[PDB]
Design a protein around this ligand. Sequence first.
Ligand SMILES: *[C@@H]1O[C@H](CO)[C@@H](O[C@@H]2O[C@H](CO)[C@@H](O[C@@H]3O[C@H](CO)[C@@H](O)[C@H](O)[C@@H]3O)[C@H](O)[C@H]2NC(C)=O)[C@H](O)[C@H]1NC(C)=O
Ligand SMILES: *[C@@H]1O[C@H](CO)[C@@H](O[C@@H]2O[C@H](CO)[C@@H](O[C@@H]3O[C@H](CO)[C@@H](O)[C@H](O)[C@@H]3O)[C@H](O)[C@H]2NC(C)=O)[C@H](O)[C@H]1NC(C)=O
Ligand SMILES: *[C@@H]1O[C@H](CO)[C@@H](O[C@@H]2O[C@H](CO)[C@@H](O)[C@H](O)[C@H]2NC(C)=O)[C@H](O)[C@H]1NC(C)=O
Ligand SMILES: *[C@@H]1O[C@H](CO)[C@@H](O[C@@H]2O[C@H](CO)[C@@H](O)[C@H](O)[C@H]2NC(C)=O)[C@H](O)[C@H]1NC(C)=O
Ligand SMILES: *[C@@H]1O[C@H](CO)[C@@H](O[C@@H]2O[C@H](CO)[C@@H](O)[C@H](O)[C@H]2NC(C)=O)[C@H](O)[C@H]1NC(C)=O
Ligand SMILES: *[C@@H]1O[C@H](CO)[C@@H](O)[C@H](O)[C@H]1NC(C)=O
Ligand SMILES: *[C@@H]1O[C@H](CO)[C@@H](O)[C@H](O)[C@H]1NC(C)=O
Ligand SMILES: *[C@@H]1O[C@H](CO)[C@@H](O)[C@H](O)[C@H]1NC(C)=O
Ligand SMILES: *[C@@H]1O[C@H](CO)[C@@H](O)[C@H](O)[C@H]1NC(C)=O
Lengths: 66, 74, 66
Amino acid sequence: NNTITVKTTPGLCESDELGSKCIVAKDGVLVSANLSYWQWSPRNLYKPENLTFANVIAVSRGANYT
Amino acid sequence: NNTITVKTTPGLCESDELGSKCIVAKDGVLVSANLSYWQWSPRNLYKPENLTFANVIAVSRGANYTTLNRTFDI
Amino acid sequence: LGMYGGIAAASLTLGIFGGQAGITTWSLAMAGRLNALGVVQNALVDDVNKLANGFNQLTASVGKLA
Ligand SMILES: *[C@@H]1O[C@H](CO)[C@@H](O[C@@H]2O[C@H](CO)[C@@H](O[C@@H]3O[C@H](CO)[C@@H](O)[C@H](O)[C@@H]3O)[C@H](O)[C@H]2NC(C)=O)[C@H](O)[C@H]1NC(C)=O
Ligand SMILES: *[C@@H]1O[C@H](CO)[C@@H](O[C@@H]2O[C@H](CO)[C@@H](O[C@@H]3O[C@H](CO)[C@@H](O)[C@H](O)[C@@H]3O)[C@H](O)[C@H]2NC(C)=O)[C@H](O)[C@H]1NC(C)=O
Ligand SMILES: *[C@@H]1O[C@H](CO)[C@@H](O[C@@H]2O[C@H](CO)[C@@H](O)[C@H](O)[C@H]2NC(C)=O)[C@H](O)[C@H]1NC(C)=O
Ligand SMILES: *[C@@H]1O[C@H](CO)[C@@H](O[C@@H]2O[C@H](CO)[C@@H](O)[C@H](O)[C@H]2NC(C)=O)[C@H](O)[C@H]1NC(C)=O
Ligand SMILES: *[C@@H]1O[C@H](CO)[C@@H](O[C@@H]2O[C@H](CO)[C@@H](O)[C@H](O)[C@H]2NC(C)=O)[C@H](O)[C@H]1NC(C)=O
Ligand SMILES: *[C@@H]1O[C@H](CO)[C@@H](O)[C@H](O)[C@H]1NC(C)=O
Ligand SMILES: *[C@@H]1O[C@H](CO)[C@@H](O)[C@H](O)[C@H]1NC(C)=O
Ligand SMILES: *[C@@H]1O[C@H](CO)[C@@H](O)[C@H](O)[C@H]1NC(C)=O
Ligand SMILES: *[C@@H]1O[C@H](CO)[C@@H](O)[C@H](O)[C@H]1NC(C)=O
């Protein structure tokens, strides 16, 4: 019915160096509504909440992470 | 052909506290045939075996996992 | 014939409760369906009641089709 336009990214890494700690969203998407920080939403509805353990997944660095 | 009715759960955690060690089944389902412990089966056939390393996957706590209060031994 | 009675009866539950039975209620079945469609991670009682009201209003509007 109503939409919102946010920023999104495939994953988040700490630093630029290869071998950094990276996270991707667990069963959801990383969103940011022009904020200074990142949040978690379901993939088909904007319902944001702050990033937590048991909300993300620790991975290795993929292509074009923020 | 023949069915059986077991208990099932999305995952198993050690304790109630957030940050506990949790496991989910790897390419299968967590089942219990009214036992005191949990086992692994294929998703479309009941063929139980005890929980092992290389049978589960260490994850973080999801919603409505079963708490053991036991510190499982793998 | 009625569709959901009789000798050759159709199943009312087979496409949302699935072929391995055990989900006790329609509220628990609909919460799992909203989770798998990616619109709510963990459906509360207000999320399921909002879906139950929208179902019941639409189904009552069938009796006013011209
Ligand atoms: C979700 O996460 C955001 C991002 O951290 C939270 O907003 C931030 O909250 C902190 C702590 O309340 C704020 O930082 C500092 O607050 C202290 C309070 O003692 C104050 O002295 C400082 O001046 C500073 O403001 C921070 O400003 C705030 N905003 C941002 C953009 O970081 C938010 O509260 C979280 N929402 C939840 C948990 O529901
Ligand atoms: C799959 O896992 C179950 C759960 O652990 C196994 O059953 C349990 O086996 C243990 C060890 O044999 C039993 O515990 C103790 O056995 C000692 C033997 O020295 C005895 O002194 C104690 O009285 C106690 O019984 C335990 O009773 C038994 N049952 C339960 C409900 O825990 C089962 O054997 C495993 N199956 C396999 C590996 O095929
Ligand atoms: C967050 O930022 C984006 C980009 O600045 C905003 O999207 C713009 O919205 C205006 C008005 O709706 C449009 O004219 C622009 O074309 C949009 N930009 C893009 C790239 O689509 C968005 O509205 C911002 N605000 C939020 C989410 O509150
Ligand atoms: C394990 O427990 C369940 C529940 O006590 C058993 O399932 C019941 O089986 C009886 C007879 O088949 C039915 O009348 C009940 O309605 C069933 N309960 C439910 C909730 O479906 C099951 O048979 C037990 N025994 C095993 C797996 O050996
Ligand atoms: C859905 O079913 C419920 C049954 O509990 C209906 O609620 C009752 O409807 C009758 C008929 O008008 C009323 O007399 C009762 O006061 C209602 N009770 C409650 C607790 O609501 C409800 O009307 C039905 N909804 C639709 C849209 O048909
Ligand atoms: C859908 O969005 C419109 C805004 O154009 C709003 O008036 C309406 O109430 C929304 N639908 C529901 C069910 O709230
Ligand atoms: C994604 O990464 C490549 C380098 O691997 C870079 O050239 C490209 O510009 C990046 N994409 C964006 C949108 O910046
Ligand atoms: C299927 O189950 C029936 C029990 O009703 C049994 O008699 C039959 O042998 C089973 N089929 C096979 C191939 O074993
Ligand atoms: C699942 O967890 C919620 C709390 O997050 C709880 O209210 C609910 O009763 C649980 N489900 C069952 C079947 O106990």
